[PDB]
């Protein structure tokens, strides 16, 4: 899993050299930032649910036809899934903030994203909206660096999805 700390170790390890000043400097960076990161996570964790509802919802407004019978958005099972899924995305995001690296995201969400989505005919687009809507809400509860961090990660997914 890719976090700041793991990477420097990795790089140090590959070369076969002790952790010198260079790397520690880097680590320090991660730790200083954490305070902001951590704050953001506490904020998302708390409002989770509400964000999720809002997102799921949004998607349907954006793509009305989904709710019609014979479609994917139709019938509760699917709605449940849709909810679940977004929860996940969120969950991971929090994780990543705390871990101080994309790692968590990469391994759970991103890797194999495409094929999953292809085989089940999930349109990336949808997820994206979810995220965007979220981003917009988050853009109220947070501010300054905490916010900035939140964004970075949220986006990172947008980019991976698209």
């Amino acid at each position: 899993m890719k976090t700041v700390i793991t990477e420097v170790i990795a790089s140090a390890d590959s070369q076969g050299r002790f952790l010198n000043n260079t790397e520690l400097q880097a680590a320090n960076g991660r730790f200083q930032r954490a305070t902001a990161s951590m704050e953001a996570a506490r904020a998302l964790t708390s409002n989770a649910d509400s964000l999720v509802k809002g997102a799921v919802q949004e998607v349907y407004n954006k793509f009305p036809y989904l709710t019609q019978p014979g479609q994917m958005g139709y019938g509760d099972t699917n709605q449940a899934k849709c909810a679940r899924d977004i929860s996940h995305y969120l969950r991971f995001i929090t994780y990543s903030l705390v871990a101080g690296g994309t790692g968590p995201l990469d391994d759970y969400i991103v890797a194999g994203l495409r094929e999953v989505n292809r085989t089940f005919n999930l349109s990336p687009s949808w997820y994206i909206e979810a995220l965007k809507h979220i981003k917009g809400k988050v853009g109220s509860q947070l501010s300054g660096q905490p916010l900035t961090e939140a964004n970075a990660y949220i986006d990172y997914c947008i980019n991976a999805l698209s």
Binding site: T6, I9, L19, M38, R42, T45, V98, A99, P104
Partner: protein
């Protein structure tokens, strides 16, 4: 790989849940100690060469045979290896210390080390001994530095120990 943070995440994942507030507070405090943590590492890396050099001297004063014809540290070529080895182990330990987790150490460094030693005919016992010798010297530095703000490093010191010990044990 793994480290303190990642680990806690993973646990949380399997439960399928957002992180407990309690759990955050483990990490929150862990952060606070960072500075201490870092210096600890720095001290080892800074003194590395010495730590080893020292440990060796003592190792060989004790187990004279290792350096005698027919022993395991004889001749030069072997000696070299033995030194190299010690170093490596150390290197890893350090890594762990930074991560705040045994894993890295266990996986790359320790796992199957014993068996290697066995196959070679190297006496595992002596290796273990060396590890400890190192341990003590290392702590020596961690715990007595110069120009650092004075406070309590014990917490870190002990964790350091543990790493050394996992090493000692699995080799032995």
């Amino acid at each position: 790989m793994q480290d303190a943070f990642t680990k806690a995440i993973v646990a949380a994942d399997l439960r399928g849940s957002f992180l407990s507030e309690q759990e955050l507070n483990q990490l929150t405090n862990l952060v606070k100690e960072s500075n201490k943590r870092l210096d600890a590492v720095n001290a080892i890396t800074g003194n590395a060469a010495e730590i080893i050099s020292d440990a060796a001297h003592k190792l060989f004063a004790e187990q004279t045979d290792l350096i005698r014809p027919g022993g395991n540290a004889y001749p030069n070529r072997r000696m070299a290896a033995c030194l190299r080895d010690m170093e490596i182990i150390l290197r890893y330990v350090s890594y762990a210390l930074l991560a705040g987790d045994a894993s890295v150490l266990e996986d790359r460094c320790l796992n199957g080390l014993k068996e290697t030693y066995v196959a070679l005919g190297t006496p595992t016992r002596s290796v273990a001994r060396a590890v400890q010798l190192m341990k003590e010297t290392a702590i020596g530095y961690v715990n007595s530095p110069s120009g650092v703000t004075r406070g309590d490093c014990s917490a870190l010191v002990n964790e350091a120990a543990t790493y050394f010990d996992k090493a000692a044990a699995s080799i032995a």
